[PDB]
Amino acid sequence: MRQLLLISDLDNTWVGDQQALEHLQEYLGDRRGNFYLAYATGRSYHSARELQKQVGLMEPDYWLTAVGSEIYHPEGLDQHWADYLSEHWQRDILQAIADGFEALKPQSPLEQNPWKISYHLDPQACPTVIDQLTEMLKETGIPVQVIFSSGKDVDLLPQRSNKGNATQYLQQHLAMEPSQTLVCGDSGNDIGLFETSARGVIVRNAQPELLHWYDQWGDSRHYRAQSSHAGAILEAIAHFDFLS
Numbered sequence: 538m539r540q541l542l543l544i545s546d547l548d549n550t551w552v553g554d555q556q557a558l559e560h561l562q563e564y565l566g567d568r569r570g571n572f573y574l575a576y577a578t579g580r581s582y583h584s585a586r587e588l589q590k591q592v593g594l595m596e597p598d599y600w601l602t603a604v605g606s607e608i609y610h611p612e613g614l615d616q617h618w619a620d621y622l623s624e625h626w627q628r629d630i631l632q633a634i635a636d637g638f639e640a641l642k643p644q645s646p647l648e649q650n651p652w653k654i655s656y657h658l659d660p661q662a663c664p665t666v667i668d669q670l671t672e673m674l675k676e677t678g679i680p681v682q683v684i685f686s687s688g689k690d691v692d693l694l695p696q697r698s699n700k701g702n703a704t705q706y707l708q709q710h711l712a713m714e715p716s717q718t719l720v721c722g723d724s725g726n727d728i729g730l731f732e733t734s735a736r737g738v739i740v741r742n743a744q745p746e747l748l749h750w751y752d753q754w755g756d757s758r759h760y761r762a763q764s765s766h767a768g769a770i771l772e773a774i775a776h777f778d779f780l781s
């Protein structure tokens with residue numbers, strides 16, 4: 538029932554340039570009832586909440602955390618989404634396979650959850666190892682996807698997950714159309730967002746892998762902003778003529 542469903546990643550997108558973050562929030566703070574806000578981050582809910590306290594993030598309506606593996610409503614964790622992601626998911630088998638790659642090192646326990654297995658790629662290892670991992674994981678028949686970003690972060694998630702799928706789920710939940718949606722991102726863990734039919738903005742300070750993706754799949758609904766960080770969101774809002 539609102540005119541815009543705003544979905545944005547935090548670090549390097551919404552966050553990173555405190556001045557832009559502040560004027561973006563001032564602008565939005567003057568028409569809060571005209572849009573639904575969702576932060577789609579690779580951070581866990583707890584970590585996202587810490588960041589909010591650090592930079593003064595305005596309160597969103599929803600939190601799509603851990604790359605969309607967990608969805609938080611004002612009233613709490615979405616148990617439907619969790620059960621949906623659990624179906625056919627085999628965390629242990631996938632972890633055993635990933636653990637076997639010498640070039641991969643497990644990320645801290647706090648970066649893991651039932652639907653997210655994460656690792657760090659050795660800086661000296663050949664990125665091609667990600668292709669081998671992906672193919673090996675897929676051949677298990679287990680519905681899994683591999684998210685690679687910043688040239689080092691590797692997340693193993695259910696195929697039904699990632700930021701884009703969480704976004705579409707939210708869109709259906711709120712009865713919001715793709716033409717009324719704006720997704721904002723900066724890296725490989727945001728590709729799922731640009732895969733949806735929502736309008737999208739790629740920040741100027743975007744990571745290599747996301748720019749490469751845009752070059753190959755970029756369409757008319759995708760906008761490459763001149764501005765970096767939060768400034769890219771204001772620019773996109775004006776570009777797509779949202780909140781007219």
Ligand SMILES: OC[C@H]1O[C@H](O[C@H]2O[C@H](CO)[C@@H](O)[C@H](O)[C@H]2O)[C@H](O)[C@@H](O)[C@@H]1O
Nearest residue numbers: 548579580604648655686690691692726
């Ligand atoms: O910007 C916050 C942190 O982002 C990284 O970690 C998050 O995003 C990754 C990509 O999805 C996940 O794999 C990881 O588990 C998340 O915590 C980055 O690597 C950290 O250095 C940043 O502080």
Ligand SMILES: [Mg+2]
Nearest residue numbers: 546723724727
């Ligand atoms: Mg990102």
